[PDB]
Amino acid sequence: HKLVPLAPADRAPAVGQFWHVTDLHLDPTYHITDDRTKVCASSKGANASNPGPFGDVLCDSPYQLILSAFDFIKNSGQEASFMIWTGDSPPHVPVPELSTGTVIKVITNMTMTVQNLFPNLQVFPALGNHDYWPQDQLPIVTSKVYSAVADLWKPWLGEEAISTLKKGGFYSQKVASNPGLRIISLNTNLYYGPNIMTLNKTDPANQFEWLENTLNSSLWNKEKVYIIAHVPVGYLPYATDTPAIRQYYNEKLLDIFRRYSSVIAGQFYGHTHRDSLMVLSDKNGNPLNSVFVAPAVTPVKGVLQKETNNPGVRLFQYKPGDYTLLDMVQYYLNLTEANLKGESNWTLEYVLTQAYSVADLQPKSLYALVQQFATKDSKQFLKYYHYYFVSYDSSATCDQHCKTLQVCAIMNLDSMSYDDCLKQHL
């Protein structure tokens, strides 16, 4: 007779879960026609290679492909308390074939698709570099796109998040279903090389100052943070000595993340359209923070490229009330198979702990895995390289130079450590 909260049984709490989707790249022009140069504007006049209802490797996503991905999530039987959605909704077409209004229409379509299918799910979006017109020119002051997405994302975001989004394309937001957890959604397109609007700016849109203040507040309020953004930190794994964002910004952002590694329980990016790991470490090689780059829904590639990805979506598992990452489940669509029979079969690609025999996703666990990758003829690395393209090509091989670039990028996010790795291993 005393109104005490009812104690849960002595069972183990279920893990928490969230989805990560990215790089949808809807092409509304997609249609099958005999002249394969007219299947999709995103192929820019190339003949689509072998187009079907779920897309083509030379095209961005048909609406049916995106719908199949979200329908899979909806019908998966997995519980999830939120979703993160890291940008890039319009297709790869020349700048004159788009407009601000068209970009907003595509982002609206994707947002409303998600809201329609998941009415009870809090979603945390980030802007991508194609989420603006012209592409990549994301500004340092308010804009029609920033205002539009603040309006579109109001169902998921509080007043303060809406205000920062409208001004600079970034926000932080407490996760309603997960007390103690905050999402920081950065606009890393401000740091992306093609952005003329931020040339020579030390702190475009004051995002670094804002990020430092936000992380310091989380530190003192005993929160944990998941960082989400479109373009990742670190180095491109397929090129030599090329930071994904401008070096000055990569160095500066990584310094903030090292300083706040104790608060940051995960970092989640897109843009690359590949499945990559990174481990942020200190200058002496001690692991600090795990970084997860998710592959795209779109399977697009250019004609010059040999490989591409299969469509992917992924799920993370975390410790409730603590937010340590426990696992990652990557799902995919075998696009060739789905197009041949005309039916999608979104399916499990791998569970990270099972694929790699690691205990969890903590920095020390993943650092040890990457040390295994570095061993000669590592079977773990062979598996990783197959998963990098979401199992698009089981015969893809990574020669010595290719492997050095991959492992160096996985392990070394800043210039000094990356270049030292090249020195040792080229």
Ligand X SMILES: *[C@@H]1O[C@H](CO)[C@@H](O[C@@H]2O[C@H](CO)[C@@H](O[C@@H]3O[C@H](CO[C@H]4O[C@H](CO)[C@@H](O)[C@H](O)[C@@H]4O)[C@@H](O)[C@H](O[C@H]4O[C@H](CO)[C@@H](O)[C@H](O)[C@@H]4O)[C@@H]3O)[C@H](O)[C@H]2NC(C)=O)[C@H](O)[C@H]1NC(C)=O
Ligand Y SMILES: *[C@@H]1O[C@H](CO[C@@H]2O[C@@H](C)[C@@H](O)[C@@H](O)[C@@H]2O)[C@@H](O[C@@H]2O[C@H](CO)[C@@H](O)[C@H](O)[C@H]2NC(C)=O)[C@H](O)[C@H]1NC(C)=O
Ligand Z SMILES: *[C@@H]1O[C@H](CO)[C@@H](O)[C@H](O)[C@H]1NC(C)=O
Ligand U SMILES: *[C@@H]1O[C@H](CO)[C@@H](O[C@@H]2O[C@H](CO)[C@@H](O)[C@H](O)[C@H]2NC(C)=O)[C@H](O)[C@H]1NC(C)=O
Residue list, annotated binding site for ATP: 92, 129-130, 238
334 binds, among ligand U, Zn ion, ligand X, none (CB under 5 to 8 A by kind): ligand X
Q: Which is nearer to Zn ion, 88 or 414 (CB)?
A: 88
75 binds, among ligand Y, ligand X, Zn ion, none (CB under 5 to 8 A by kind): none
Q: Which is nearer to ligand X, 308 or 334 (CB)?
A: 334
Contact between 119 and ligand Y by CB under 6 A: the answer reads no
Residues 113-152 that bind ligand U (CB under 6 A): 113
- Residue 110 C-beta: closest distance to ligand U, Å: 8
Among 28, 53, 134, 320, binds ligand U (CB under 6 A): 28
336 binds, among ligand U, ligand Z, ligand X, none (CB under 5 to 8 A by kind): ligand X
Q: How far apart are CA 392 and CA 382, in angstroms?
A: 14
Annotated binding site for Zn(2+): 23, 25, 88, 129, 230, 271, 273
Contact between 23 and Zn ion by CB under 5 A: the answer reads yes
Q: Which is nearer to ligand Z, 281 or 310 (CB)?
A: 310
Residues 126-145 that bind Zn ion (CB under 5 A): 128-129
Contact between 216 and ligand Y by CB under 6 A: the answer reads yes
Contact between 102 and ligand U by CB under 6 A: the answer reads no
Contact between 345 and ligand Z by CB under 6 A: the answer reads yes
Q: Which is nearer to ligand Y, 36 or 230 (CB)?
A: 36
239 CB-contact burial (10 Å; exposed 0-12 / middle 13-18 / buried 19+): exposed
Contact between 256 and ligand Y by CB under 6 A: the answer reads no
Provide φ and ψ at 22, rounded to 5°: -155, 160
Contact between 262 and ligand Y by CB under 6 A: the answer reads no
Binding site for ligand X (CB under 6 A): 334, 336-337, 391
64 binds, among ligand U, ligand Z, ligand Y, none (CB under 5 to 8 A by kind): ligand U
Using the structure block, give the residue that is written with the tokens 């991959």: 406
The Cβ-side half-sphere exposure at 68, using a 13 Å CA radius, reads 25
112 binds, among ligand Z, ligand X, ligand U, none (CB under 5 to 8 A by kind): ligand U
Q: How far apart are CA 391 and CA 311, in angstroms?
A: 10
Q: Which is nearer to ligand Z, 286 or 347 (CB)?
A: 347
Among 13, 50, 74, 112, binds ligand U (CB under 6 A): 112
Contact between 56 and Zn ion by CB under 5 A: the answer reads no
Q: Which is nearer to ligand Y, 39 or 279 (CB)?
A: 39
Among 50, 347, 397, 400, binds ligand Z (CB under 6 A): 347
Contacts of 400 (CB under 8 A, 6+ apart): none
Q: Which is nearer to Zn ion, 128 or 139 (CB)?
A: 128
Among 220, 284, 376, 377, binds ligand Y (CB under 6 A): 220
33 CB-contact burial (10 Å; exposed 0-12 / middle 13-18 / buried 19+): exposed
* Tokens at 97, concatenated: 């074939």
Question: Which residues of the shown chain bind ligand Y in the complex (CB under 6 A)?
Answer: 36-37, 45-47, 212, 216-217, 220
Question: Which residues of the shown chain bind ligand U in the complex (CB under 6 A)?
Answer: 28, 63-64, 109, 112-113
